[PDB]
Amino acid sequence: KLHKEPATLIKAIDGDTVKLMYKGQPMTFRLLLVDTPETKHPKKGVEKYGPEASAFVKKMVENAKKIEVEFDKGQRTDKYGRGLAYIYADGKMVNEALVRQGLAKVAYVYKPNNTHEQHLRKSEAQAKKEKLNIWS
């Protein structure tokens, strides 16, 4: 099954990306399965709810006692060299938290990197139902 490994915050970079110290090396991590509005959009620049989504994972990871990373069963890095993972702050999955708050959508999914897909999609259905943020 999947397993969680410890990491240390280096810097939150955007709503969907954080830099961590992982096994003694600085690495950039892309949050698996979520698309967030971005502040660093390659074309768009700063989208609606981008600052808010980015402020939320900053707070969450900067105020955590314990950060853990959980790789999925497929590829662990994307084509830009970023780790592909579920990130946890004190036991709470940052990826699900963003979706639950209406600050991210579930991304297009690539098997077999889809272990928590159903879980995330349920949280997204709920944020939609509650008309939160991006769904308002």
Curated annotation (Swiss-Prot):
Annotated Ca(2+) binding sites: D16, D35, T36
Region described as Disordered: 116-136
Full-sequence range covered: 88 to 223 of 231
Taxonomic lineage: Bacteria, Bacillati, Bacillota, Bacilli, Bacillales
Basic and acidic residues bias spans: 116-132
Protein origin, superkingdom: Bacteria
Subcellular location per the Swiss-Prot or TrEMBL entry: Secreted
Ranges in coiled-coil conformation: none
Active site location: R30, E38, R82
Name the record gives this protein: Nuclease A
